[PDB]
């Protein structure tokens, strides 16, 4: 009955708090529900204080990234999308819209004066049963090369439906596949290189049979080399300061200073000869280099490459068969990088150095000669997501069925459980099951088909036991993806459902929203 908060500090300890949270959640859900299925249309994140910076995106990750809110539940869901995108890729859309539908269920349930803990326990049990059922339906492959390759092709093709690049799916999905082949079973993500060069077409893009570098060369370096013996270095080479300090030159005549200069030139030449004793035809420097070392190298006539990148040099050491060195007393204890030819290439209006016939091909370099910067940015986002999915499906070989197939499978399993369950939970779980039914429904809504007809047909098919039944998105019919080729990652859907479950658990267990008094701005 007495004021206790600071000016600007608010507390809603009634259903108005959940009302505000729910309307914010719905505002989140509808904004992204247009970015799902093969029928999604992209959105614009327009700025006014960011000096008019815009980005077009389809995977709602960036959308929730670029929008804030005062209602803390919407920020909770934004962080949930953050997590989801941190795991694999697309599905943030899925998990967010699913959370919207489940909170709408919660709305309908609270509309009947029910203690939410019953809902919580029932959803716990329903999630346990659904995860068990899906695991029992987990279809696995990789025992055959052709089968596993076709599974990856199906996953990639299905995934490109959710984004723009579908227009050249056959020229993109398959290509991405070979990229993860070049990983050679290594778990690294940071070997694939992303390149954006406006101009040209997405079909004009290609995967080169080698590697490329985008750094300046030294003053006198040859343009082309064959059978390059390659070494990578990280030292001074910038008049190679002695690294010792608290030492001073203190003389009374400048002849000694002249001799010191001559001696430092000689010492630098000694370092150069120390390096050349190993014997190379191509040198790499992660950082800059000075004029006198450049003249010495030109006397040697080798390739010196200056001011490279830490991640890039790590990648190239993985690639060409060498490792970075910093001391050169051992022409015997180092492995040298190897390539067939190192030439010059002009791409876009930027200059690149081309590695052709590299001894190995672990890392990857994907050049995008697209047509606009914004399409380039969204293309790189999409390929990042796709390669993350590819890496994840290479990691765990188990796969699942999309087009609602697994979805209606768990829906029907929860249906039967609720049927054999007494109490409110059952219908709640049934509504929970109904909640799941909304997910493929919205997909059809993206297509704009006969919604209720299709949902009824799928429920009838899954009640009949046809466990491969799905939705045909090419015409609006019901078929088998085993014929069609619509397969997805078991890990992806599994974690989608589990994360959605725990997010619902945490969101439903709220009772009082208290926004602290703003500091200032």
């Amino acid at each position: 009955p007495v004021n206790i908060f600071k000016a600007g500090a608010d507390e809603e300890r009634a259903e108005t708090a959940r009302l505000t949270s729910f309307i914010g959640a719905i505002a989140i859900g509808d904004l992204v529900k247009s970015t799902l299925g093969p029928k999604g249309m992209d959105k614009i994140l327009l700025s006014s204080g960011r000096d008019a910076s815009l980005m077009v995106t389809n995977d709602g990750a960036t959308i929730l990234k670029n929008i804030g809110v005062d209602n803390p539940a919407a920020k909770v869901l934004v962080d949930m999308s953050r997590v989801q995108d941190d795991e694999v890729g697309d599905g943030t859309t899925s998990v967010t819209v699913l959370a919207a539908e489940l909170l709408r269920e919660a709305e309908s349930l609270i509309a009947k004066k029910i203690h939410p803990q019953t809902i919580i326990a029932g959803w716990r049990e329903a999630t346990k049963a659904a995860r068990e059922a899906l695991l029992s339906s987990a279809v696995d492959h990789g025992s055959d090369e052709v089968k596993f390759r076709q599974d990856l092709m199906n996953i990639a093709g299905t995934t490109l439906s959710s984004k723009l690049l579908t227009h050249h799916k056959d020229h993109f999905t398959k290509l991405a596949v070979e990229a993860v082949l070049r990983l050679k079973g290594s778990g690294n993500l940071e070997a694939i290189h992303i390149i954006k060069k406006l101009g040209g077409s997405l079909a004009d893009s290609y995967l080169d049979e080698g590697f490329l570098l985008d750094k300046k060369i030294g003053v006198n370096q040859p343009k082309r080399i064959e059978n390059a013996k390659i070494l990578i270095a990280n030292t001074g080479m910038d008049t190679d300061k002695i690294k010792i300090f608290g030492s001073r030159v203190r003389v009374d005549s400048t002849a000694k200073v002249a001799e010191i200069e001559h001696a430092e030139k000689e010492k630098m030449k000694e370092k150069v000869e120390r390096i050349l004793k190993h014997g190379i035809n191509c040198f790499i420097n992660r950082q800059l280099i000075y004029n006198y070392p450049e003249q010495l190298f030109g006397a040697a006539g080798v390739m010196a490459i200056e001011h490279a990148d830490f991640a890039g040099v790590e990648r190239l050491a993985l690639v060409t068969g060498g490792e970075i060195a910093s001391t050169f007393d051992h022409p015997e204890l180092v492995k040298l990088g190897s390539c067939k030819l190192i030439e010059e290439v002009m791409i876009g209006e930027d200059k690149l150095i081309h590695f052709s016939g590299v001894a190995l091909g672990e890392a990857c370099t994907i050049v995008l000669r697209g047509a606009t910067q914004q399409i380039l940015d969204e293309a790189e986002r999409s390929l990042h997501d796709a390669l993350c999915v590819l890496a994840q499906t290479v990691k765990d070989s188990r796969t699942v069925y999309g087009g609602g197939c697994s979805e209606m499978l768990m829906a029907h399993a929860v249906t039967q459980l609720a049927n054999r369950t007494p109490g409110k939970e059952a219908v709640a779980m049934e509504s929970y099951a109904k909640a799941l039914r909304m997910l493929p429904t919205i997909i059809a809504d993206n297509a704009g088909y006969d919604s209720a007809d299709l949902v009824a047909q799928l429920r009838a098919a899954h009640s009949e036991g046809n466990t491969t039944a799905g939705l045909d998105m090419r015409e609006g019919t019901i078929g088998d993806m085993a014929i069609l080729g619509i397969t997805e990652s078991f890990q992806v859907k599994r974690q989608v459902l589990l994360s959605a479950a725990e997010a619902a658990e945490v969101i439903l267990r709220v009772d009082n929203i208290i926004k602290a008094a703003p500091r200032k701005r």
Partner: protein
């Protein structure tokens, strides 16, 4: 990080300033050993400290 004429000229200017104001504590070092793997695209960054409180900043 020594090597760029930016950092070299800044070091020259501050060293010459030391000749004028011997009442100011100057500190120079390699940021790599001061901050691990510090981004080399963020130099030379001027820091103004007293009692552990940043008063002035001049970054990059």
């Amino acid at each position: 990080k020594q090597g760029i004429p930016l950092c070299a000229l800044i070091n020259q200017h501050l060293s010459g300033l030391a000749r004028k104001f011997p009442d100011v504590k100057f500190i120079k070092a390699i940021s790599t050993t001061c901050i691990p793997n510090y981004p080399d695209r963020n130099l030379p960054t001027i820091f103004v400290y007293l009692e552990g409180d940043i008063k002035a900043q001049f970054i990059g």
